[PDB]
């Protein structure tokens, strides 16, 4: 839209997308940014196990359309204060991503179903707390995945799923058994007036 570029200081509690939502005027792009801003997980207790579930608008994959429309608006504005070649390159990129809409929809639905089915096979409480060691992931692989996905579906193999479930329940049982043993020993030691 040719508005003055924002200088988002590194460290403000606000996010760049929040400021963009508070700034721009066009409808679809603002709606999509607003969706990506406050989209948080929901804590749901199922069968005595705490889990994290995405919003229902993500599993059926309709929100992707609410993405694409906004992107489509990005192809209509004249891109003032920019040379023609930059606009041409950006339009080429957005068109290449747009023509694969069905592939993206299928990939997102597959991801949602696979995550739900697999995550339903854990039996220990989970929390959303950032840890120290952080995973490294470059975006070129993501671009390759978005450009290379096809038609064949992928469903987790039942044998692998059962093996994973068995390992997880074994780990949980071992953890609980060791906890109880340690608690019993410490309680007995502190009740027998042991202090040396």
């Amino acid at each position: 839209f040719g508005m003055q570029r924002m200088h988002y200081r590194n460290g403000d509690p606000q996010t760049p997308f929040q400021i963009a939502e508070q700034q721009i005027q066009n409808f679809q792009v603002a709606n999509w940014l607003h969706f990506v801003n406050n989209n948080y997980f929901r804590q749901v207790v199922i069968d005595g196990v705490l889990n994290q579930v995405l919003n229902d608008n993500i599993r059926n994959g309709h929100v992707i359309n609410q993405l694409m429309e906004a992107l489509m608006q990005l192809s209509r504005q004249q891109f003032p204060t920019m040379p023609v070649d930059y606009k041409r390159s950006i339009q080429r990129g957005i068109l290449l991503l747009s023509n694969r809409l069905g592939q993206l929809v299928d990939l997102t639905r597959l991801l949602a179903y696979s995550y739900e089915t697999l995550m339903a096979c854990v039996t220990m409480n989970m929390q959303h707390v950032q840890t120290l060691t952080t995973e490294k992931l470059q975006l070129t692989s993501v671009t390759s995945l978005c450009m290379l996905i096809g038609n064949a579906t992928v469903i987790p193999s039942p044998q692998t799923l059962f093996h994973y479930y068995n390992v997880n329940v074994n780990f949980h049982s071992n953890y609980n058994e060791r906890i109880n043993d340690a608690v019993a020993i410490i309680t007995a030691a502190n009740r027998l007036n042991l202090y040396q």
Partner: protein, 397 residues
Amino acid sequence: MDVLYSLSKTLKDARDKIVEGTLYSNVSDLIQQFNQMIITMNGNEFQTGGIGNLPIRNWNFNFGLLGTTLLNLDANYVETARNTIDYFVDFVDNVCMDEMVRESQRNGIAPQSDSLRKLSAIKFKRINFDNSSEYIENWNLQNRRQRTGFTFHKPNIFPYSASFTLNRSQPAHDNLMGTMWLNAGSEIQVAGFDYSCAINAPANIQQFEHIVPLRRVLTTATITLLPDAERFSFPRVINSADGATTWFFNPVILRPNNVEVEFLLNGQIINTYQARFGTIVARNFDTIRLSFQLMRPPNMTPAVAVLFPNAQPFEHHATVGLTLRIESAVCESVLADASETLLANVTSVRQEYAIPVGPVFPPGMNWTDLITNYSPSREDNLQRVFTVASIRSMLIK
């Protein structure tokens, strides 16, 4: 309709909060609201007026936005915002002035003015700051088929109609028995007078009754029933019913005996009170029926005995009186009050530019005739015009 209230409330809040020196982190909400309003408002013209002497005006909209660059508001930003705000205030005032005068017999709950009708379109529905105010909230709740209400102070609902009904009458008015009542504003005073002073009355007791209807159902009425009425306790000389002769009235106020106050609804008894004076509470009523008895003094004293000769020659009639006041009440429909100038605004706007009388409102907005024959279409039109009037009175103080 709600669009106009949203605009007025947003303008007032912006005029309230945008003052020099304030920190921007306290008007972020209103800044977003104002920017959205400017984005949606631009590009659409308007027309108002065209009837009577009201000034026809054309409208344009081309304004900038209010960016986020400062940390504390300076004078210049406030001045720019204020310059835009005053223009929008003038726009709202003129739209309201156009809307108030007109009316319609049918669909009298829908918008009528061209500007308001265009405003009701869907693409403007993104501006609704709140609905906290009483009248707009009542309108919104009435939109969805729900019970409503109105907190009214001294809610004048009784039409003004001075009238009396005789019960016993000589041709030359020398032996009268009847009732005088006067219903002014929200004040009812009923008096029962006798010339015989219960000397020839059956069982020496004269019976009095009086029923006054009410066109609209109220609720939660604090009723102050004070005896010893004042409207008829002094000498009078009035014309007769046929308007061909007159009569005299020499009153003496006695003690009203066994005062009975009844409040009815739908034809059944709701709340009753016997021989209680002061303040009472009624919860749901539509018809008021006041009845009591005038009791002859069982024994007298020389002056009293002379004052009530048993025979026909009479020179001092006796009367009892009661006063009915509604110091507070809640109704289900819009009515005239005294805590605002809504009816005053309607009357002033109607009279200022001399709009010829239409097919609904009687000429001059005389409240007596308007409340005389109450019809649902009239009530709906009055509700809409009063909502617009309350919108106007929330911008110009």
